[PDB]
């Protein structure tokens, strides 16, 4: 592995990074409750910044349609972010009550899978 | 824990004494290990009826060289109010043999925990500790108690 000498900047300690399924976008979430998306096509420059989490973000996933991504944090809230419009989001409040979502994944473009420390796996139908 | 089993008659006697005919209500009662030392039986002829100094005739009932359990329905009148609460008394004289002291002490929680609702426990390890009327008052309400057994303290 060769260090390319490129340092993308976040708002705090990075907690999860996930490339898009087509590799056109890199989304970085940190402990400063911010999700930063970098456009791989244009010099790995910042594309958008998404606000709304009020606690440390712990997980992140990219939808198969390459236009939406979901992030779960320690605020016990899951947000599904529209890549084009940062102002639109889906608030899944207390997907797992009293437990933060430890990991999450997408079955398809409309089904979101969330797990947590309560040892349960849940599937959610996301409608935009 | 010694492993002895508290007799069922002890629980019924405490239940009758805890709630409040009068001429048959018990003011004091003694408990002892059975002859085989596997049951906390009730002593047949060691008890005080309410109709019958009630505390003096109870202390003299305690053996001088053996340990016993007791349940006294001590009555006292504090400054604010007059109340009556049961007192669990663990009589364990120093002159008692070593085995008797150990078995009674290790099985005291077997009987005390079976009598739920008891709030006062007097541990008397000598005659001066049980004859002493002041310490019983302190156990009941401390400085709040002014008179015990109807007499000033």
């Amino acid at each position: 592995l060769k260090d390319e000498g490129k340092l993308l900047e976040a708002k705090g300690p990075v907690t999860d990074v996930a490339y898009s399924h087509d590799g056109a976008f890199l989304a970085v979430c940190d402990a400063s409750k911010v999700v930063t998306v970098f456009s791989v096509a244009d010099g790995y420059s910042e594309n958008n910044v998404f606000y709304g989490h009020h606690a440390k973000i712990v997980c992140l996933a990219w939808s198969p349609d390459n236009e939406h991504f979901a992030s779960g944090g320690m605020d016990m809230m899951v947000y599904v972010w529209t890549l084009s419009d940062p102002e639109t989001r889906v608030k899944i409040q207390d997907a797992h009550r009293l437990h933060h979502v430890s990991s999450l994944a997408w079955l398809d473009e409309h089904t979101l899978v969330t797990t947590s420390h309560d040892a349960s796996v849940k599937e959610w139908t996301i409608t935009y | 824990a010694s492993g002895v089993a508290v007799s069922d008659g002890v629980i019924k006697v405490f239940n009758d004494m805890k709630v409040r005919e009068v001429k048959k209500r018990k003011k004091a009662v003694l408990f002892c290990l059975s002859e085989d030392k596997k049951n906390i039986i009730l002593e047949e002829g060691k008890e005080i009826l309410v109709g019958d100094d009630p505390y003096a005739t109870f202390v003299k009932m305690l053996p001088d060289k053996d340990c016993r359990y007791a349940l006294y329905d001590a009555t006292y009148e504090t400054k604010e109010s007059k109340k009556e609460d049961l007192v669990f008394i663990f009589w364990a004289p120093e002159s008692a043999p070593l085995k008797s002291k150990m078995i009674y002490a290790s099985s005291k929680d077997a009987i005390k925990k079976k009598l739920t609702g008891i709030k006062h426990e007097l541990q008397a390890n000598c005659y001066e500790e049980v004859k002493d009327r002041c310490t019983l008052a302190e156990k009941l309400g401390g400085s709040a108690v002014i008179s015990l057994e109807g007499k000033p303290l």
Partner: protein, 359 residues
Amino acid sequence: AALVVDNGSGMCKAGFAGDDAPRAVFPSIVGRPRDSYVGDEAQSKRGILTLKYPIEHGIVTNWDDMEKIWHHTFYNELRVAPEEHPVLLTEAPLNPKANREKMTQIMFETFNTPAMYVAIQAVLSLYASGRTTGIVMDSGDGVTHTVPIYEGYALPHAILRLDLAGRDLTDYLMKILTERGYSFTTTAEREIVRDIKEKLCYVALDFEQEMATAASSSSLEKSYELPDGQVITIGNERFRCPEALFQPSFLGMESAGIHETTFNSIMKCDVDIRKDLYANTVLSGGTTMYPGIADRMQKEITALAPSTMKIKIIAPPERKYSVWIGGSILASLSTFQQMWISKQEYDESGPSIVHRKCF
């Protein structure tokens, strides 16, 4: 027949349930060359080997040496097979739960004991005195414990551990006996000094007045005959050695005395129960067997305690082996046969059964 083993910090007391005294009392040491000698063998093997305490302050730190001591206990000292007798074991106050389960595992898997039980040393001493509420001042070989117990429940937040005990007093007596010209340095000579400590030492009610008495007369001087026939004399060292219990500064230590440690633990409890603890201070252990220690403890605690309170120090004549005697009485009861932890119960719930059955 059941076995009662008291795992002391410096001495292991073992015997059979129903007996008045332990059959075997041997040092809790494992000696290795400067192959492995355990107990009195390590003492009677010259200064050619290093001595190590698996239990040094009440807590087992080396579990490999503890098995050697237990193996020595059953086969060489008790001369019984552990697979045929249930064993009752005693544990120090504030013993970690992991150590409690490890002791259970060794008995059932290494020694294959049919039944097994664990009791707290402090509560066994208090029960043997006919008490359920009180504070036990257990001063042993390597550690001194003040355990306040209320209605059979020891108060962990108020238990104080003191490293001063008989082992430090034996070394102190060796140091101050060289002032008279008596050179006690070897391991064999250390056991002689321990015999002098256990026979001629006493606690003075007034230390400063007693020191003047010793310097102005010879009534306090006593003679001790060494194993080889020589007679040595000891004067003010009789009460100076146990004075380190109340003045740890004699040993260069920072900690408070046994009287102040007892007072500190009492004041760490609820005010409602301090009156009962003050009048139920029970002494136990070998280091509490000095004549005049109850009178000195009564006087020193009275100074610290409020004047309105009543101070009673209980020093039963059997307090040296009160932990073992209580366990022997308990394990010999016909009702205790259902309180044991069986082998069948062990390999169904694991070592965690000790937290449910016992404690």
